[PDB]
């Protein structure tokens, strides 16, 4: 989804609306953001549906991995951002 990349900050948004908050996990492992989402079989509008996904982003060169923050909204936007130095 959306992404901001300015001189000072970066921002990455994801549509994770099919996942509840216990079903998502953000890890900074080195110079990589990992987003993981897993959800077991469950009824929905058309039938039954399980889902899994695993995403990796490279951290911009001028981003200390230790200053990266995460946020989760109720309607399902997951954001990762960071200052740049």
* Torsion of Cα atoms, 65 then 15 then 11 then 21, to 10°: -40
1-85: CATH topology: Immunoglobulin-like (2.60.40)
Could you tell me which residues are annotated as the binding site for Zn(2+)?
18, 39, 41, 46, 54
The number of CA neighbours under 13 Å toward the Cβ of 25 is: 10
Tokens of 52: 């899994």
Domain boundaries, the chain: 1-85
Technique used to solve these coordinates: X-ray
Sign, CA torsion 81/29/34/32: positive
Q: Which helix (H) or strand (E) holds 70?
A: strand 69-72
Tokens of 62: 């001028």
Tokens of 68: 């990266």
Assess contact for 73 and 5: CB atoms under 8 A: no
Rounded-to-integer distance, Cα 67 and Cα 54, Å: 22
6 three-class SS: coil
Tokens of 29: 């492992």
Rounded-to-integer distance, Cα 16 and Cα 23, Å: 10
Could you tell me which residues are annotated as the binding site?
18, 39, 41, 46, 54
68 three-class SS: coil
């Amino acid at each position: 989804m959306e992404m901001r990349l300015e001189k000072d900050r970066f921002s990455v948004n994801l549509d994770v609306k099919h996942f509840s908050p216990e079903e998502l996990k953000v890890k900074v492992l080195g110079d990589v953001i990992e987003v993981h989402g897993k959800h077991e079989e469950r009824q929905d509008e058309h039938g039954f549906i399980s889902r899994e996904f695993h995403r990796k982003y490279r951290i911009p060169a001028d981003v200390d991995p230790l200053t990266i923050t995460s946020s989760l909204s109720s309607d399902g936007v997951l954001t990762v951002n960071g200052p740049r130095k």
